[PDB]
Amino acid sequence: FDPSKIKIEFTPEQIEEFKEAFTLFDRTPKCEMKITYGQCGDVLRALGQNPTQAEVLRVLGKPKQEELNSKMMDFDTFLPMLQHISKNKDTGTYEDFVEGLRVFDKEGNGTVMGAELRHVLATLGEKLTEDEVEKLMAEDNGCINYEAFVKHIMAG
Amino acid sequence: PEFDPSKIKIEFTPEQIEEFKEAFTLFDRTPKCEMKITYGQCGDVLRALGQNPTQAEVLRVLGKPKQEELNSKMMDFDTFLPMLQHISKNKDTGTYEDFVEGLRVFDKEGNGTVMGAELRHVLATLGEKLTEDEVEKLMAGQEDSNGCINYEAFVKHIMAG
Amino acid sequence: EMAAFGEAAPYLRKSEKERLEAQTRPFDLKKDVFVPDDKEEFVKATILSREGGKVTAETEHGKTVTVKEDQVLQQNPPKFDKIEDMAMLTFLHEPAVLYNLKERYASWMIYTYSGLFCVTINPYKWLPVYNAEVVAAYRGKKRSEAPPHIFSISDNAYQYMLTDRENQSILITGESGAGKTVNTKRVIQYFAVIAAITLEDQIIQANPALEAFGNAKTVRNDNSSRFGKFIRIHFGATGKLASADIETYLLEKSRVIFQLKAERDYHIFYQILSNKKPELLDMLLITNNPYDYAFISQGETTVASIDDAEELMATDNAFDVLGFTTEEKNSMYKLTGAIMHFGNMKFKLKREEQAEPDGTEEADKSAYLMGLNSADLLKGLCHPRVKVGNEYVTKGQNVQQVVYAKGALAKAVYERMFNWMVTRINATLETKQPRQYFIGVLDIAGFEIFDFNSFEQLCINFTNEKLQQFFNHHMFVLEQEEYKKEGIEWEFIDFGMDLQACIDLIEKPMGIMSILEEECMFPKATDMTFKAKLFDNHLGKSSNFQKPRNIKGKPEAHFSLIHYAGTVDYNIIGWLQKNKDPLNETVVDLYKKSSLKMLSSLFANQTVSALHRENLNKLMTNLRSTHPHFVRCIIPNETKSPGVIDNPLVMHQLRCNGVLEGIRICRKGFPNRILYGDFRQRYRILNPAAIPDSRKGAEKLLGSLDIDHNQYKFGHTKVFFKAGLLGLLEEMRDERLSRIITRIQAQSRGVLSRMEFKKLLERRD
Amino acid sequence: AEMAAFGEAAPYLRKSEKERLEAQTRPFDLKKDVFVPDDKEEFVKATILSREGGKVTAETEHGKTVTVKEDQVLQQNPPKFDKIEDMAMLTFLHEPAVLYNLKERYASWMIYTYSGLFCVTINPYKWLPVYNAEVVAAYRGKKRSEAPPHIFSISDNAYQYMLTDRENQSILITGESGAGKTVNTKRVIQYFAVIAATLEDQIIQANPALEAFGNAKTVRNDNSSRFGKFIRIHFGATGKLASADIETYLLEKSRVIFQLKAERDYHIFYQILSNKKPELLDMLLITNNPYDYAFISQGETTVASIDDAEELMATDNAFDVLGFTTEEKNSMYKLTGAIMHFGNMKFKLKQREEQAEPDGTEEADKSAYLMGLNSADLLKGLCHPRVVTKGQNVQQVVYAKGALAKAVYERMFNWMVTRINATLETKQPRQYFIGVLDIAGFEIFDFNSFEQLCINFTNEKLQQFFNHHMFVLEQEEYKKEGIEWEFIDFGMDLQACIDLIEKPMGIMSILEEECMFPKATDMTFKAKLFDNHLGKSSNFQKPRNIKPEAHFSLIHYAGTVDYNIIGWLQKNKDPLNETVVDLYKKSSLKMLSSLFAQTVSALHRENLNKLMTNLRSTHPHFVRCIIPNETKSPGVIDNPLVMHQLRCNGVLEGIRICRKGFPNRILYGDFRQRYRILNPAAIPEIDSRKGAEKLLGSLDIDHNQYKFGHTKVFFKAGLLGLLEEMRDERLSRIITRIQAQSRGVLSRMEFKKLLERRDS
Ligand SMILES: COC(=O)N1CCN(Cc2cccc(NC(=O)Nc3ccc(C)nc3)c2F)CC1
Ligand SMILES: COC(=O)N1CCN(Cc2cccc(NC(=O)Nc3ccc(C)nc3)c2F)CC1
Ligand SMILES: Nc1ncnc2c1ncn2[C@@H]1O[C@H](COP(=O)(O)OP(=O)(O)O)[C@@H](O)[C@H]1O
Ligand SMILES: Nc1ncnc2c1ncn2[C@@H]1O[C@H](COP(=O)(O)OP(=O)(O)O)[C@@H](O)[C@H]1O
Ligand code: VO4
Ligand code: VO4
Ligand SMILES: [Mg+2]
Ligand SMILES: [Mg+2]
């Protein structure tokens, strides 16, 4: 197996802190400490990681939509996945994020129109849903100061 | 003491000498009919005998005379003949092409024609100026129906005469 | 994927199977060549023998030819088949270019990039490549992902405008029927559709309205433009469509009253007579027969490719969308009808040599529609008033004199009505919306040679000559000047592309126009005093001026002019009258005192050659303050045959256009250049670490990339890019932007997931 | 004098053979006699006393002891080069050689100097006897060797180029305000009009008529041109004077109703008020006091150098010679008087509403009477313009009143130009033209507004026209013709500054866009300029306030100008009361009715680009006018002021391209037509290039001074001067031989008569 070759570097105290956190995602009636394949990414993010949809699907072993909705996963199968995702450090700099949003700044002024940023985030890259964009965005005239916005998304 | 006409060799045939003697004689205006010319009428006799010297060239064979010498200094045929021989030696009298190129300067539109009044002005003001009398005698006749001269035809005319 | 283009996809880019076929086609670089052909310019061949400086090859048809080593040209490997940009070809020569174009055309791919300009061959068949789906498919695409198309040129011009902060022009060249009007209308379609995501509706409808009055069937084109035009599309500082305007140049007045054998008058006359709107025939007091109207029935009356009935609906609808009132539309139709009746006014000699009317019926109808008195009209035409000093007396006129005057008036009404319509379209297109830039589109009347060439062919062909020189100056003069001015190591190349000798023959003092203008100021001047002055000043003096090449049976001429696109034989009869354009002032005064408001205003207001030369020099300056983008339209054959290429005809156009020379300056030079500040704004995203000064920033940024460092040069104010470097930097920027947005989204997903986890932790099942 | 047909002008044009010899034999040592930099005089003459370790110790001409570096020391030109006519012929070409040549000629009242193919002229501030019919006669056809530098010489050369090259010419006269552009423009016209000698009389009288209405006293010039103009003088194919026309550009409308402290309104107002023609004061219903008329008395009213009485006679006479009728002249005077009364119309607010109403009717009555209007209609139109009426406060009426006065004046000026053109038009055939350009020159006042930007932008564009022709097109010509040439960067390019003013997102463009926003203010316009250009455009800076306040600085070619942006939006839009305009259309005065039968920056930019194209289709000849000092002092030179003008004009760079390049060129066919006379044997009567190679190779000349191009032979200007002397001497020899042959014919004709009497 690919998860079997991965070495657990977390302290026993860290394991238990991820274990206590994992419990809030468990929706099993008998509380058997299990989450669906489709909610792995949400737990990885809750635990401080920021993987792409592609990265989550790779640690899950390229699952089908049926596996995402109904295949179960315990803490023991999740912990090696968390360790692998924890290894990636090329998550993009503050300068990359500002340079990316600067593309959409039609003039000099370090602002972008709210509707344009909402469109870009919902159409380009790994598309966010209109629900995710509304929750994320909720603007000054109706413009976003993209340098502040990057500081905001990176602090959260 | 020596002279510049004395060093010149007479190459004309005795028959030519006698022909030039009569021509020289027809220009005689002396009161005693002595058959002598003034220094100033030498150019005329040189030209009548087929030469075309400039005023500068005539004055040089005459030994750079004063106006008083031109009007009243008498000359016999014997002093004239060596002068005629010297003038006869100059062959750099200008080509037909030089004469056309000279008159072409005044052709404003590349016509092959020049306005009569302009040619009359040029001939009476530039170079060794002709008198208004000499220009009238030379130009008549004449200009075309519009008052223009076909220079080049005019060059052929002046060179044939 | 080519999926976003829909049904257009195969007509824009070859299939994945075909590029796998090109990638695996066996080829012998030493055998597979091009050889000259006396009937096909060049042919493909395989060398048989190899060696003593002589090569023996097997033709593609195939014959056995023996040619010299120097005459043999190498074929480009199959990888280069139907290549999108011909500046990317390994061997660049005449048959490589010709065969790339022929092969794309055989596949109905009519657009090809030629470095920084475009080549287009007329398909003579409508293809499904010009719809809103294709407009949308191209929106924002700069090469690579975007196959060659008129929408691509238009889009690229729009991006240059915003990046460089300068005005743009799309200059569409070509002979008559090459495709300039078709491509002009597709540039407009692109921008109007992009704006719709109405001014957009009105910009599109301006051309059907103008074409009805300014276009006609000639021997070369069924829809020939008989006037020139420059359409400016205005944009706001951020690139939003703001306004538009149209400038028209010199309508061919003579077509209104005269037609050659295989020609028609302006479309409108036949559109009205189609009887599609029967109320127009009744309003104009006309029949449905064009042979009843003298000025309009001299040549042809029907065109197989034109449905005059359907086109009348297009014309009338165009006016509605443009906001023309019922009085405006009706007045235009009525004046067109008045012109029709005017031509049918017959005259006869009194045993005197004075004209008098034959009948009065058509004069009565003319005057009624024009709001004039027919007794006044007929007296004005037969006895024009002349001023002696104190009293007004009349001038005598014979039938030939009245007939000439009758025609001159009709042409003046028509041209002024066309001018009114342009002004009226401009009043609609004008929005009072803030502007900052513009994209100008130039659609001239193309190069033409008829059996009979007069003054109108000289004006047309002179405009074409001036436009090719504009290409020559920009591509080979200003381009090389730019490198020097900026301190780029550059050795001057003479491309042999200069038409100044011919331009000087037509427009400079003592030239054809100047001699004509001076002759117009001499009252006793004739066509033959004019013919003599041309010969006296130019035969054996001007290389482009020659004797005519007259043939018995065919119409004769007075001289030949060696134009860029060919030698044209010109007939000088009536050029003085054409240039002066005299009008009967007695009738002009009746037009000023007209009860029909439009006619009254048309005439309320030196020579044709003076005005034409002024408009051309004004145009050439508006264009010099612009970044130009050339579209080179090519006619494939002389028989309007779809998919058929006449090799000598295509090659002649490629040569006189300087297509090869144009590709060469793009390959050898640095076609793209950007200011250091603008370079930092656009390409810092590639490596922000290299730019934590603007010139050093560009040196550090570019030096840090895995690129060929011989492909860019540093100037005093700009970075210069070789051909292909921009395309790489644009692919690298797009991929990096896609990765950054994906990382912004991954971080954003982490925030939202952490927000919800905080709600769960606060105690929320 | 010696070779003078110039009369009394001779010493003011070329120095005596006596001076030539005193110069030549004066004390001079090439190793000692040098130029050194000076912190107050730019450069000074000096004699080297010491030299050690790359440091030179010299004795100044004043004289102090200076110690400078070897690289700072510049060589003086030997006495043979004293007061040289063409500065391109100087052995050592540098800034002090040029400056001191000009200073020394000026000290001798020789105000014209050749600078290669262009000319430099320094304002004498004194009238010299160099511009009369005798001097005109003496320049006719003369070559640069037989003709001292003069404006008549530039005019004549232009005329020769026109006939030989068969192309249109232009004489472009540059300079700051008061440099001498209008003076030299009028002397170009005088030259051609005298050469021709009523068209000649009318061409000369067009300028006194235009100057009365378009010229005014500014702090810089007592006769400042407040409009630009291009005069075309038309010629027939053989060079006979045919016709003339005048194109005027943008008259300064604001001067009509407003004046700064040390300024006057247009000359005409003071000419009328002079009481020289007392019937005009009675006809116009005016007093003789300018202080009674608001519009014209804000600044100064009298100028020491101007006799307004004498000038009124010059104006009235100019109109007579131009064929203006009594009704034409009277209508112009009456409208000028109407404008004077219009400025004195007072208004007040209504008791209970922010609405204006008249405060008196006397001046309105006089205005309407002269304008052929009803004063009740005029006052109702100004207070209640029709849309149903619009409301107007006093500030609104006052502004509208001024806008209408300026519109009448400008249109009347436009009418006068058209009327002069109708007279100048002879229906005589033409083939070529010589165009003369007289713009309003570079100026800096204590207060610089929109009109100074338009003026200084025109000057900036004209210097770039010089730069482009001299250093861009010139080097381009050599390359396209295949002449061996290495590109030289002369450092003369003003595109950055031109782009800041006229390109999209520039000053004019921002202003134009702001005019299309109804809520826009002068301060919203100031913000957009700063947001787009401060720290982005090098030529755009912060103002340098001290006295009247400015909003920004513009680094122009000739200096840094501080601009005030107040009222630029209204100035650019130029709104007019359409109800009053309708009364002017329905006027009983035919003139006013005919006069009235998008933005200023848009129209100005269009006129400039039209002008630059008419000029690009001509061969240009530049005349560079220089102001010597800032006090109008005759014969006094301020070294830093002269040097600054020579630098920003690019005089030295201009001389260099003439010396290093090939300023003269001729087509092979035209070369054969003109120089075959030099040696007809070299070109027998195919091939035009081979003919030129054989002819030129056959002459005793420096064969490095000509080059063979694809279509032309290129020459050094010096070589052209030699070939012209060689052609003239050879023509004199050929005419002498034609005369010798002609004398032979006449003598042979007479001899034939003598022979027929005796021998034949
Ligand atoms: C291949 O795709 C394209 O056509 N584009 C993609 C991105 N471009 C934006 C941008 C990139 C870097 C340089 C150019 N500026 C251009 O080189 N200057 C231009 C100016 C005058 C002349 C005669 N030649 C060159 C700049 F627009 C715009 C189009
Ligand atoms: C008095 O001294 C003179 O200045 N001239 C002497 C003779 N000239 C007749 C003739 C001779 C040789 C060549 C020229 N053509 C001229 O070089 N071409 C000209 C045209 C374009 C530009 C930018 N620079 C060069 C010329 F016309 C006329 C004056
Ligand atoms: N891209 C094209 N697609 C289809 N038909 C075309 C195309 N280009 C030209 N044509 C045909 O050729 C005719 C002439 O083209 P047009 O644009 O009017 O030529 P031009 O303005 O150069 O004279 C058109 O009416 C049309 O029938
Ligand atoms: N050549 C000259 N001779 C005499 N006075 C001159 C000359 N050039 C200029 N001036 C003086 O300078 C003044 C201003 O000259 P002007 O032509 O009006 O300058 P510009 O038109 O450049 O502003 C003239 O009124 C005159 O007094
Ligand atoms: O057929 V054309 O539109 O080129 O006139
Ligand atoms: O004083 V000026 O004529 O330069 O305006
Ligand atoms: Mg067309
Ligand atoms: Mg002036």
Numbering used by the authors:
A (entry chain G): 41 to 178, 181 to 182, 184 to 199
B (entry chain H): 39 to 199
C (entry chain B): 5 to 201, 215 to 367, 369 to 623, 645 to 731, 737 to 809
D (entry chain A): 4 to 200, 215 to 404, 411 to 570, 573 to 622, 645 to 732, 736 to 810
Recite the paper's sentences.
In cardiac muscle, cardiac myosin comprises, in part, the thick filament of the cardiac sarcomere and powers cardiac contractility. The force produced by myosin motors is generated by coupling the sequential release of the products of ATP hydrolysis (Phosphate (Pi) and ADP) to a series of strong actin-binding states and the swing of a distal elongated domain of myosin called the lever arm. Omecamtiv mecarbil (OM) is a selective, small-molecule cardiac myosin activator that binds to the catalytic domain of myosin and increases cardiac contractility in preclinical models without affecting cardiac myocyte intracellular calcium concentrations or myocardial oxygen consumption. Here, we describe a previously unseen conformation of the bovine cardiac myosin motor in the PPS state that OM stabilizes and binds to with high affinity.
To visualize how OM stabilizes states of myosin at the end of the recovery stroke, we co-crystallized the bovine β-cardiac myosin S1 fragment in the PPS state with OM bound (OM-S1-PPS structure) at 2.45 Å resolution (using vanadate as a Pi analog). In the OM-S1-PPS structure, OM binds in a previously unseen pocket of the motor, which we call the “PPS” allosteric site. This “PPS” pocket is not only separated by more than ~18 Å from the previously described site in the PR state12 (“PR” pocket), but also its environment is completely different. OM occupies a pocket that can form only in states of the motor with a primed lever arm. In this buried pocket, OM is at the center of a network of interactions between the N terminus, the relay helix, and the converter domain. The nature of the interactions is predominantly hydrophobic, although the methyl-pyridinyl ring forms a polar contact and the carbamoyl-amino moiety makes five polar contacts with both side chains and main chain atoms of the surrounding residues. Interestingly, comparison of the two OM-S1-PPS molecules present in the asymmetric unit reveals that both OM molecules are in the exact same position and interact similarly, consistent with the fact that the drug is tightly and specifically bound. In particular, the OM drug is more tightly bound in the “PPS” site, as indicated by the electron density map, and the fact that apo crystals can’t be grown spontaneously in conditions where OM-S1-PPS crystals grow, arguing in favor of a full occupancy of the PPS site by OM. In summary, the drug binds into a pocket via induced fit and consequently stabilizes the lever arm in a fully primed position.
